[PDB]
Write a protein that binds this ligand. Structure first.
Ligand SMILES: [K+]
Ligand SMILES: [K+]
Ligand SMILES: [K+]
Ligand SMILES: [K+]
Ligand SMILES: [K+]
Ligand SMILES: [Mg+2]
Ligand SMILES: [Mg+2]
Ligand SMILES: [Mg+2]
Ligand SMILES: [Mg+2]
Ligand SMILES: [Mg+2]
Ligand SMILES: [Mg+2]
Ligand SMILES: [Mg+2]
Ligand SMILES: [Mg+2]
Ligand SMILES: [Mg+2]
Ligand SMILES: [Mg+2]
Ligand SMILES: [Mg+2]
Ligand SMILES: [Mg+2]
Ligand SMILES: [Mg+2]
Length: 95
RNA sequence: GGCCGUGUGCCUUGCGCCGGGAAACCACGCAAGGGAUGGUGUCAAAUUCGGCGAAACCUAAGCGCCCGCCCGGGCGUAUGGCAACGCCGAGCCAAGCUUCGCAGCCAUUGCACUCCGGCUGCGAUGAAGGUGUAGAGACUAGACGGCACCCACCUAAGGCAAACGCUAUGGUGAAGGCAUAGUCCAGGGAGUGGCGA
RNA sequence: AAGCCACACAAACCAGACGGCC
């Protein structure tokens, strides 16, 4: 459902078949229509497959994303988004 | 096919010894002998281009000595050879392992910020080992080769055990294959000529 | 020398360590 606001957003239930470097392109573009985007972490490991972390410059780019993008059918899959349950290493190196 | 020798290799034994190893055991240097060297399964591909090294055995150009000197000889000797075989640079290689690609199936609904789930199919890599290295060589298999497993034996670091101790992920079970078993062909048997002393 | 290199080729047989003698 929902967590507590954070710069980065946890996306899961993605299409596990799509390649690492390819999925980042489909993410950086599709989520930039809210604001500036930092980095995107995608792993293919048994634990991290079908999951991706998208980092925004501000909560404003993130809050709108979570709402306007929740359920957004990505590669025939109901893209599920949550707020990050722990601050990203990228951001914590500034705060 | 037999014996008799010679060298080189091999293992065993003894003796030595900066060594690696927890130990067994390997490694190294030598001398002497030939008594012993487990089993099943699996791979068969690359097989190229160069270079170094070499004992016995073959021969004596030059050199030394001798036949008092010439001519001829004679004796010695490899720096000339044949060659068992020790190797190096680069390339290449089947199956099996190291790590990455691509495809499929299995599972996975998973919160990460360093990298990572399994297998099967080709693609490429890395460590072995091989190829190079047969009488010019050509092709077939397999083993003495590569790989996996089993067995006998030694050892017991670690792991286990309160403890006598237990137990291989450690070792030992030769080298040959610089052509092994085969078919074939070059070579000698058995020609002429050249280079060469 | 020993060997090595060319073309030529008859057989058993010997040849993929060397020297003997069968
Ligand atoms: K011998
Ligand atoms: K020692
Ligand atoms: K060889
Ligand atoms: K022990
Ligand atoms: K030979
Ligand atoms: Mg014997
Ligand atoms: Mg073949
Ligand atoms: Mg060959
Ligand atoms: Mg003379
Ligand atoms: Mg004279
Ligand atoms: Mg002599
Ligand atoms: Mg010589
Ligand atoms: Mg060669
Ligand atoms: Mg022994
Ligand atoms: Mg061979
Ligand atoms: Mg041989
Ligand atoms: Mg043979
Ligand atoms: Mg002849």
């Amino acid at each position: 459902p929902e967590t507590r606001p954070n710069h980065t957003i946890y996306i899961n239930n993605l299409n596990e078949k799509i390649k690492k470097d390819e999925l980042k392109k489909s993410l950086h573009a599709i989520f930039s229509r809210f604001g500036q985007i930092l980095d995107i972490l995608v792993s293919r490991s048994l634990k991290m497959r079908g999951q991706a972390f998208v980092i925004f410059k501000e909560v404003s780019s993130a809050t709108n994303a979570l709402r306007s993008m929740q359920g957004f059918p990505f590669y025939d899959k109901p893209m599920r988004i949550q707020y990050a349950k722990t601050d990203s290493d990228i951001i914590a190196k500034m705060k």
